[PDB]
Ligand binder design. Structure first.
Ligand SMILES: Cc1ncc(COP(=O)(O)O)c(CNN[C@@](C)(Cc2ccc(O)c(O)c2)C(=O)O)c1O
Ligand SMILES: Cc1ncc(COP(=O)(O)O)c(CNN[C@@](C)(Cc2ccc(O)c(O)c2)C(=O)O)c1O
Lengths: 602, 602
């Protein structure tokens, strides 16, 4: 429809569109109450007119008012103001899409459970569409998807899929050896996922028994392999191994590079060596959007490697943790859902308003990674992150809908609970995601413009911080950024011009956070709020060494400190894409930081 | 505060309190927008006055209106009208508490994540209170609890707790044998949960290593035991075994009686025999509130047995699945949180308005079961069920807060995600439960009156159906109820006076449902809606035999049909507690059923 103002799809940092929200909220509530009054309209109201004027009613209503007044006080005292544009530079949390908030409230009035079509048939159809929409976002042909409570529970379901998938070859031999005839025990534990599926889908009257001898029985859980994850992974993955059964001991950290993306060379070493040891890879986890750095792993090279190892009879499952950057793929899809060629990206992004300045914003290495998500088997995608959908809304997407039969217990499912890890779920959550996917198409005409604004605002902050020098009473403090953002997270540190004590930078940056957080002061009066993370050698290795040395520290001071405290800003605000609007909040950030540093040292 | 009208704590079956809802909704939204405008009030609105009058804005707003209009159409076409009182007699779904709906919407405007205190400190304190409130509901002293996305995910976390708990004895010997010195391998796999906890809490500088050798490593998952569940259990438990690692093969169905409650004698047989086989019980699952019958298992006798077997060195973990009836315990607690003596129940329930007619409504056998929930280790409680809190809100409660350290990864937790199975969670979900727990105390002064009304309305329907005879063209059809409700679910069947074909009753009852559902007709025009369930011998055994024979069928016709189709009504409406209000909807149900049966046969 030509052009779409994102400035109307949010309530606003200063409640600029608060009447629009309130008016559409009331219009929707009024439509639900009309539905209610006109279901069995011959029935007269059970709550009488005199009951609603009684003292019993007034005392109950006044008590509700007192409880809601206490919720209001606590929420307006101890809550964080990330709705503001150029003052919040911290965690992956900004404003949520008004269409989604309006739709959750509307559907919550029906209280539908999506575990069963019978409970809410309309919210259930919406969830199936949302999964078919998640598949077409990931270019998965004949794929599927479902909303998960959170992204940690979706990462778990991924391991559930793979755990049960690698267990199927061995089980097939134990129930219908005919399917896996002439196959070495090790050729079974290195069978491609497509073949395992094609075989199972062939044995119609045997799928149940093959699955009864699968990992669902509890056997072969240590034999299916070792889960390979980036070392800078999320604890959801550690927890996933513990719960699924493989155990934390069958998790191997794959080292990351100085851009904090998995070292594909090192992955090759780990995989090839474990295969010489005849131990399989249950699977490798690729991360698009790192928890602390916004780093996009080279899914392109992870999948390229898989192909090269298949010639040597080694296959691994690939699950993409795109909890953060999954919605980010929309910046690469046209209105016909085709991946835009890179040579045309900058031109298409000017035609659609994704980016306001015609320059490179996305590296071909991140483009190539986002593209190869279609060759992976499963993806964790979190609407409650860069989908700007309200919590709790996570998501999983599978490359082949048939895969759901490896998790299946017993067309739109009539019992989604028999195709998912969780049980009872809100259909309001589905209406929230469907509304957002329908106001904002999962392409360059909708979510692309929103993610583009997040990225362009991250780049303006990056360029602002890379020239920031202060002056705190004969103490010049310079700001230094960690790496060029692969998405929209800009990490940064503060340093005294001539302090070669990393423990002193790690204390400067800890003190900047302390002031830029609830730790010190009232959060309703903080002029700049940011996030903090420690990069410790136990988990990050010497991946930050290049950075620490660039700032003038030694490899011994690094091993002495044991870590670097980095400040993190996931720029999810969609208001700082315009350099002009950023240049208003620029002096407001510098002035705030000066005072903050001036309180730290005096 | 004397007396509390529940008729003001709901929007209404005919939107009687829709202005109150809308007015408190707008008052709350207005309080949030004021908070937003007055955080950094020196900042001028980024969305300009002219932007909000532009055609770009109007076209975007009109598209949002069109999407929300499509959600409205689909939701008002294919949704179920359970808000009505005496016309919906089906699944555990009625109206949700207005205080909770108002509070979710208010807190959703802050979009707080409860996985971390830093994200929303106010919603996080509310969740800790809600868990301390769940513990005092279950009389757990020094206990704790947390909100789970759903009850299936809470049942999983229970198995996570027990799986890791039984694994601790063996692991203790492998890291600090000193703690479990002089203990047989089998005395370790039959150690009481308190001792395992007291031992682990003693080895301060070793807990991490003991846990690293626990089931979290992936070892000893088949050695920890067999999970014992009622045969009429929920598939969440089957799924839980598959995911946790023990596997579906280590799940033993314990047979139920003709009241569809676990046969404690049969449990004794299974437990004692498996102990002679030297195979441990990972744990036994007790169910308060059955999925299809509303049956309360004798936790009293399950725990009594545990004590008796401990003399023979056999201990089992007990997890209570009170997803449905957990909130039901409030009907037994005084304003000082003491369990009311049974001899006084009827008198206290008249003093508090829990029951309007002074008669027995709760059997001493259900009282005794609800009381012994305090001796169990963990309980699944679903606010999104009989807590009348909106979906998705489930819950877990642990008898000892220290138990969280067996699941712990790394005062109010500063990272609840390291004490729970899930990750990112809505703080709005917490504000919804906290609001309900604060308007309705978890005792006889709040939730007791609501659950009492649900139960008294279930009893009036039970007594109505037990004398219901029709007349469909020389075909007299009589209604027969399954069992006396243990909570608020009344199961029932329809039968032709002289049809001894159970397959014909199972078709009569299937046809009654077909008409009383979305299967046949428009659901906005259904005058009576009910639920259906098949009781098959594979899962229910000969537990329905007494019932089928009472209706005049033979033990051969039972084995021929293989099942009985039962109609189910979980009376969660709080409006039918008054016989006078029920007697209005009584003729409206009989008239509807007559027509329904008259369509089936002609
Ligand atoms: C890269 C990555 N993958 C998966 C997940 C798990 O997702 P989910 O939270 O839905 O279960 C994550 C985790 N992301 N969540 C955060 C960023 C949440 C958070 C927000 C604000 C805070 O103040 C804190 O402390 C946490 C997390 O780190 O857990 C992920 O990053
Ligand atoms: C006794 C019992 N225990 C645990 C659970 C799992 O709880 P959760 O749903 O929160 O994950 C259940 C399941 N209860 N859910 C229902 C009753 C849901 C449902 C409502 C309406 C419908 O039309 C259908 O089909 C299902 C279920 O049976 O799954 C439980 O009963």
């Amino acid at each position: 429809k030509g052009e779409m103002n994102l400035n109307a799809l949010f309530i606003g940092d200063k409640a600029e569109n608060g009447q629009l929200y309130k008016d559409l909220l009331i219009d929707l509530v009024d439509e639900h109450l009309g539905w209610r009054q006109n279901y069995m309209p011959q029935d007269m109201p059970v709550i009488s007119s005199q009951e609603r004027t009684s003292k019993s009613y007034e005392k109950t209503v006044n008590h509700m008012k007192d409880v809601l007044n206490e919720i209001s006080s606590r929420m307006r005292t101890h809550s964080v103001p990330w709705h503001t544009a150029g003052r919040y530079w911290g965690h992956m949390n900004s404003e949520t899409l008004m269409p989604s908030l309006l739709a959750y409230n509307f559907a919550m009035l029906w209280n539908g459970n999506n575990v069963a079509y019978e409970s809410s048939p309309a919210t259930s159809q919406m969830e199936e569409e949302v999964g078919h929409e998640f598949a077409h976002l990931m270019s998965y042909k004949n794929g599927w998807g479902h909303i998960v409570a959170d992204g940690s529970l979706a990462n778990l379901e991924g391991l559930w899929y793979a755990r049960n998938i690698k267990s199927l070859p061995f089980a097939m031999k134990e129930v219908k050896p005919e399917l896996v005839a002439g196959k070495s025990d090790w050729e079974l534990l290195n069978m491609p996922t497509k073949e395992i599926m094609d075989l199972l889908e062939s044995a119609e009257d045997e799928i149940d028994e093959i699955k009864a001898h699968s990992a669902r029985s509890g056997k072969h859980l240590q034999a299916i392999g070792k889960w390979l994850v980036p070392q800078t992974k999320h604890y959801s993955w550690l927890k996933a191994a513990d719960i699924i059964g493989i155990g934390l001991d069958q998790v191997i950290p794959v080292p990351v590079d100085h851009n904090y993306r998995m070292d594909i060379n090192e992955l090759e070493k780990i995989v090839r060596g474990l295969a010489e040891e005849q131990i399989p890879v249950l699977g490798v986890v690729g991360v698009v959007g790192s928890t602390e750095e916004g780093a996009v792993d080279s899914i392109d090279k992870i999948i390229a490697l898989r192909d090269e190892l298949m010639k040597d009879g080694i296959y691994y499952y690939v699950h993409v943790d795109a909890a953060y950057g999954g919605y980010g793929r929309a910046i690469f899809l046209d209105e016909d859902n085709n991946f835009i060629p890179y040579e045309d990206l900058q031109d298409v992004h000017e035609e659609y308003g994704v980016f306001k300045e015609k320059k490179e914003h996305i590296s071909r290495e991140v483009y190539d990674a986002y593209k190869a998500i279609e060759l992976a088997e499963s993806v964790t995608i979190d609407p409650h992150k860069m989908g700007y959908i309200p919590y709790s809304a996570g998501g999983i997407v599978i490359q082949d809908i048939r895969m759901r039969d490896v998790i299946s217990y017993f067309d739109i499912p009539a019992l989604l609970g028999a195709y998912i890890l969780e049980g009872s779920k809100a259909g309001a959550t589905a209406a929230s995601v469907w509304a957002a996917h329908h106001v904002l198409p999962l392409n360059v005409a909708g979510y692309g413009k929103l993610i583009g604004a997040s990225i362009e605002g991250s780049h303006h902050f990056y360029n602002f911080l890379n020239d920031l020098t202060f002056k705190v009473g004969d103490k010049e403090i310079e700001v230094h950024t960690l790496t060029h953002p692969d998405f929209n997270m800009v990490d940064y540190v503060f340093k005294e011009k001539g302090n070669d004590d990393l423990v002193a930078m790690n204390k400067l940056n800890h003190d900047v956070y302390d002031y830029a957080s609830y730790v010190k002061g009232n959060i309703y009066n903080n002029e700049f709020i940011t996030s903090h993370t420690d990069f410790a050698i136990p988990d990050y290795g010497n991946s930050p060494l290049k950075f620490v040395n660039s700032l003038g520290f030694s490899d011994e001071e690094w091993n002495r400190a044991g870590k670097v405290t980095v400040l993190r800003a996931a720029v999810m605000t969609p208001y700082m894409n315009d350099k002009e609007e950023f240049d208003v909040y620029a002096p407001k950030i510098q002035a705030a930081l000066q005072e903050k540093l001036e309180q730290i040292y005096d």
